[PDB]
Nucleic acid binder design. Sequence first.
RNA 1: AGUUACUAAGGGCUUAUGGUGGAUGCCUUGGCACUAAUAGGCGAUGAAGGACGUGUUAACCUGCGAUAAGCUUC
Length: 55
Amino acid sequence: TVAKELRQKSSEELVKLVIKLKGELLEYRFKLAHGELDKPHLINQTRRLLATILT
RNA sequence: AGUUACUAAGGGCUUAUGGUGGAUGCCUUGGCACUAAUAGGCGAUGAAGGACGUGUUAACCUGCGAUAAGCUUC
Ligand SMILES: [Mg+2]
Ligand SMILES: [Mg+2]
């Protein structure tokens, strides 16, 4: 399902996606370390989407 | 003058009860010995075995490997 959407995308757009999700993942981990993450599941979703884009 | 019971500090016997203890009985996500087939290897495209790390999840165990409690396809 998600893999189909990324397959339609080109390569350059994918590397933009991976860097943006990397940045967001760092922010989520920092906010969690400050006790300011209301939604604690976005860390897992970011990592899975990151792993899928890598695949 | 004569023959005399009561005493139980404590102990003994019988029976009943309580406590420590896990023997006997029943059972088992565990072992043992084989039968009928399959198969008889893995590794420089990095092995067997380990260390470390990975959670929204204290530690331990299991899974996994910076794509880290999972990724794609049929
Ligand atoms: Mg007495
Ligand atoms: Mg007595």
